[PDB]
Amino acid sequence: ARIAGVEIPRNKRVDVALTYIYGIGKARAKEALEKTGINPATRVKDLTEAEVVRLREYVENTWKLEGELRAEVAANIKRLMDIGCYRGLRHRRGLPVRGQRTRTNARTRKGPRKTVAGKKKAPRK
Template identity: 35%
Template structure:
């Protein structure tokens, strides 16, 4: 019996020695203070980055740019924004932007005030910056000058020309008066106006 008790005691001693080792490993795991510190440091770094980003001045875009009494789209490029002026096409806008020393592919809303002023001056002096053959009012009827009309001046000029043709009783003026096609298009199958008339069948004669 005594031998059995000694064996049990000897068997318990290694288990007791192993227990502190396991406990030691468990005690080693909770040491997570450096990880928390690093997490706090990361949070602090992220806050610092956000603060740095907020400190940088953001470029404010102008959604509407006013040139030649027209509201131009500030989100589009210069060469396409200038086409918002009635009487200026894509080819003229490219020439005007280059004459004003402005990048045609730059966004209109981000342009500094100096470049916008240069564009205004170039548009106002249109005839001096565009070739003669690109003007839309060559040899004006009333003045004989070569001009380029834009905006409301262009719409009013077109109306005055149509009224002049009507007063002259020219062929085009008469066609304008009657609301018919002016440039020689066919009228049998297209351009019909007025009341819709369907197929009219003759009434059957009364049976005798």
């Protein structure tokens, strides 16, 4: 509990729990458990306060986590928005950025479908 800022993950295995933190995933979980010596398997509620500190002292003092990340990412994007950059423009319009197609199939970045009219004088559609 309170392993990263505000992050209280509880009651699951400690390796799963840590992933409930922002800049922390299957990897860094595995890692920070090795480098601080806590068994992956133990439930979070079954943790020595002395262990929860070696965790916090590591995770918190060794990577950019939580809002401290979300902050950088946000300014990392405005960065290429301020300059003329092409990826910046794509971000500005809210279209794919990694050279994907946009004729079909861009829904996840585009959002839900903004349907318009079909024909004026043509076949059945």
